[PDB]
């Protein structure tokens, strides 16, 4: 294309905590990151004779 | 990702429910102690201390709002089925008097011959 | 027939003309205080959470320490949690105290 | 188990003192070595998608 499109991807986040006798465990979290964008130009030269 | 090839941008998706919250970690103060399967009021939370703790240790309190068999009541009082239950932190015993005690439950089964009680636990208000 | 229709973990509400909610944030709507699972606009239907669960949030007044065990009151005017215990509504109790980032873990309450 | 056994050992201490032809020889004693103690914990986490 004239300009490209950013890549996307999801990621989970969690940390292992100490779990003493019969407690509630704290959940994790999901998040997304996106890539950058690139584009392409045009060039040209010529001659007349 | 340090040293990543590309300057990517990370967007967080918010999430409020950190946990189910049926139990709460709590830290023992100086004048507090616990042993397993005994009711306690620690740092404003009332529940069943599932673990032993003596001094600055971490213990967890069951606050499931389930039905609990306790005993450890003021034996002189009568506990009919349906009566509210209050925790007297000074005496560390359950009681129906509501002078300055925390409301913690309602009796499901009346005081038997051995002072045993079944009661629903309340939401820690 | 059964009286129970749902577990009651979530409750639907209809946004008024002065209310608008975004995903995963606390909002007091029609007397129900909970976490909205949808981004809602005026006159739209959203679902809140009343799960009696432990909840994370930093939408707090950063003036007073939220030491563990203290009751958390929701101030609908400023739209923040606080330990004022004034006419503001009671919504929970702190499980983990405020950190340097001003983040709170607290247990919701049954909307009495 | 959640707390590991402590290894034990028995050791006999004795010291040689040169006898003077007339002094009672002093007797040794026995000492017990005790190993360290290790504990096993539980770590956990999860997601609620």
Automatic annotation (TrEMBL), chains A, D:
Protein name as catalogued: Uncharacterized protein
Organism: Clostridioides difficile
Positions spanned in the full protein: 100 to 148 of 345
Automatic annotation (TrEMBL), chain B:
InterPro entries reported in the protein's UniProt record: Phage_VT1-Sakai_H0018
Name listed for the protein in its UniProt record: Uncharacterized conserved protein
